[PDB]
Amino acid sequence: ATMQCDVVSVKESIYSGAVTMLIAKGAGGELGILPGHAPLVTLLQPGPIRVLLENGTEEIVYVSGGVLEVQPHVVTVLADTAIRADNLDEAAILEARKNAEQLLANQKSDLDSAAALAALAETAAQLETIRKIKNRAQ
């Protein structure tokens, strides 16, 4: 039948929704999971986990470290790095993510500094020079 299965990395969820058949490689062996299965907790081994959908097609999700839990109706996948993928080759996209983050950090460091710190010095240029020449009565 259908079980509500959820795949989630510590950052955020990756997969959610009903699933029919789950095939993984637990801390021990590989197992097949169907709704109504016994309550169990298993340690995810590195590699992709592939599950069968209600449409008759099968999803696959990669895991590099994580834990797996099964209940007769609900499955939660607390994976360390949970990535929607088919092969352990997402190295080409994780680096892209890191470059995006560091680039936006570069934008932060520039626009904070370039705008303010420059303007910080600029706005404080010659204030007292003007303040003293007030009391000039001439």
């Binding site: 989630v8 990395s9 510590v10 950052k11 955020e12 969820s13 907790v41 839990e69 939660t76 607390l78 360390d80 790095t81 890191k98 995006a100 983050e101 560091q102 936006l104 950090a105 932060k108 460091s109 626009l111 904070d112 500094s113 705008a115 303010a116 303007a119 600029e122 706005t123 240029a125 010659q126 003007i130």
Partner: protein, 192 residues
Amino acid sequence: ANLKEIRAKVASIKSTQKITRAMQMVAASKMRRAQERMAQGRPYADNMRRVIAHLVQANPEYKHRYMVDRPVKRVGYIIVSSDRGLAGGLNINLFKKVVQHVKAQQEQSIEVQFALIGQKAVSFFKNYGGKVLGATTQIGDAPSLEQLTGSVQVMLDAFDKGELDRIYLVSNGFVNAMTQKPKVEQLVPLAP
């Protein structure tokens, strides 16, 4: 007369005014971004603590050093800060509070050890002295788990040595969109 440079200063200040406005609304967008980023990771630890509690009630046979406090001789502190200033004394208030707390602990004749996050605290506490165990730079406004993995791992190892026996976060609590409070709380000796 010499009014010219006065006019120039006025214009420059006006430009800086619009600069600050742009900066502030940009920061507001980023704050809403982080603030929605808050809860997204909640259910992870929620259900995880849930099954942890199920385990411990099912198996009360022991409490590990990671749930119950052993007598402390050195206490560890994970201190988060920024690399960009211009955020009031928020980081400074955190530094003041953590310095106050660590001074309060030093009367207990116990050493203190550190975990450094952000250039603000980096400078502040490489000036503040003590025995730092780790330092981290350039979180980026989006971090990676691996970035803090080894940092926290060193802290765990120091706990395993029995040298660190209580481990503290040093962060700032989101009171609301305008109000922020510093916070320093132990986490490794697990509270009920």
